[PDB]
Design an enzyme around this catalytic site. Structure first.
Site, PDB file in Angstrom:
ATOM      1  N   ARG A  88       0.820  -1.188   0.000  1.00  0.00           N
ATOM      2  CA  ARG A  88       0.000   0.000   0.000  1.00  0.00           C
ATOM      3  C   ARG A  88       0.858   1.243   0.000  1.00  0.00           C
ATOM      4  NH1 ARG A  88      -5.427  -1.778   1.815  1.00  0.00           N
ATOM      5  NH2 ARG A  88      -6.363   0.298   2.159  1.00  0.00           N
ATOM      6  N   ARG A 123     -22.562  -1.564   0.566  1.00  0.00           N
ATOM      7  CA  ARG A 123     -21.676  -2.657   0.815  1.00  0.00           C
ATOM      8  C   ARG A 123     -22.072  -3.292   2.121  1.00  0.00           C
ATOM      9  NH1 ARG A 123     -15.075  -2.973   0.797  1.00  0.00           N
ATOM     10  NH2 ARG A 123     -15.017  -1.101   2.059  1.00  0.00           N
TER      11      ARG A 123
END
Ligand code: AP5
Length: 214
Positions: A88, A123
Site C-alpha cells: 500500500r 456494501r
C-alpha cells in the site's frame, strides 16, 4: 502464482480475490481482513489499528509488514498466494523486494473516484470470512444473509462518507505511486502488469481476469 491486486478504495479487489482464490486455489491474504480480525479478537499483533482504520488512515508500515510476513510463512502460501491491499506504500513494496518476494502479476483495478461513495453505501459483509456484497450491484441470494453460512450481514465501521474521502486522499498520496513502481517492475522484466476496468459488471470483470490469468 503470486498476484498483487492494486487499486482505489472499493474498486472491487476483494470481490475478485474470492474468485481467484476458489478458481486458482491460492489463498487470499487481505491485510484489511487480518487487521479487522486482530482488532476484533484483541490480538497483540494488530489490535493497535482500531483507531487508525476508524479515522480512514493508513496503519504504520512496520506493523502491517510484520503481519504479512507471518502469514506468508504458513504452509498454505507455499504455492503462491494472493495479496489484496498489500503493498500500500513504497516502504511496504520495498520490503517485499528485500525479502525476495517477487510476484507474477500486478493487477490494477481502475475505477473513477466519483463511483467510490455509492459503492460504500450498499456494501455489506460477512465479517468472519471477508465475503462482500452490494445491495444493488452484487446482492446476497437471500436479502441480508451470507450465501454460504446464512449468517447476518454487517456494514464496515469505516464505510462512512467522510472516512472514505480521507481514504481516497491517502490513496492518492501514498498508494497510487505503486502504479508507477510496478509498471517499472514490469518494464524490467520482474512481473507482468495488467489494468482492468473496475466499472464493468462483476461477471464481466471476472471474465477479463480469466483472460489475463489462464
Ligand atoms: N497494507 C496496509 N497498510 C496500511 N493500512 C492498511 C493496509 N491494509 C489495510 N489497512 C487499513 O485498513 C483500512 C481498510 O482498508 P482495506 O479494507 O484493506 O482496503 P482495500 O484493500 O483498498 O479494499 P476496500 O475494502 O476499500 O475495497 P475493495 O477494492 O476490496 O472492493 P470490494 O470488492 O470490497 O467492493 C466494493 C463494493 O462495491 C462492490 N463491487 C465490486 N465489484 C463491483 C463491480 N464490478 N461493479 C459494481 N460494484 C462492485 C462490492 O459488492 C462492495 O459492496 C485502511 O484504510 C487502513 O487503515
Amino acid at each position: 502464482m503470486r498476484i498483487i491486486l492494486l487499486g482505489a478504495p472499493v474498486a472491487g479487489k476483494g470481490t475478485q480475490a474470492q474468485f481467484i482464490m476458489e478458481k486458482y486455489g491460492i489463498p487470499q491474504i487481505s491485510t484489511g481482513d487480518m487487521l479487522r480480525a486482530a482488532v476484533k479478537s484483541g490480538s497483540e499483533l494488530g489490535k493497535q489499528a482500531k483507531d487508525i482504520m476508524d479515522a480512514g488512515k493508513l496503519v504504520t508500515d512496520e506493523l502491517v509488514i510484520a503481519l504479512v510476513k507471518e502469514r506468508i510463512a504458513q504452509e498454505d502460501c507455499r504455492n503462491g498466494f494472493l495479496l489484496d491491499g498489500f503493498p500500500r506504500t513504497i516502504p511496504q513494496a520495498d520490503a517485499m523486494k528485500e525479502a525476495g518476494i517477487n510476484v507474477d502479476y500486478v493487477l490494477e483495478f481502475d475505477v473513477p473516484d466519483e463511483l467510490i461513495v455509492d459503492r460504500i453505501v450498499g456494501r455489506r459483509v460477512h465479517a468472519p470470512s471477508g465475503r462482500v456484497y452490494h445491495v444493488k450491484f452484487n446482492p446476497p441470494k437471500v436479502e441480508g444473509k451470507d450465501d454460504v453460512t446464512g449468517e447476518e450481514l454487517t456494514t464496515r465501521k469505516d464505510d462512512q462518507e467522510e472516512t472514505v474521502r480521507k481514504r481516497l486522499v491517502e490513496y492518492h498520496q501514498m498508494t497510487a505511486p505503486l502504479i508507477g513502481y510496478y509498471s517499472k517492475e514490469a518494464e524490467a522484466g520482474n512481473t507482468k502488469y495488467a489494468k482492468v476496468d473496475g466499472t464493468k459488471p462483476v461477471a464481466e470483470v471476472r471474465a477479463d481476469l480469466e483472460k489475463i490469468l489462464g
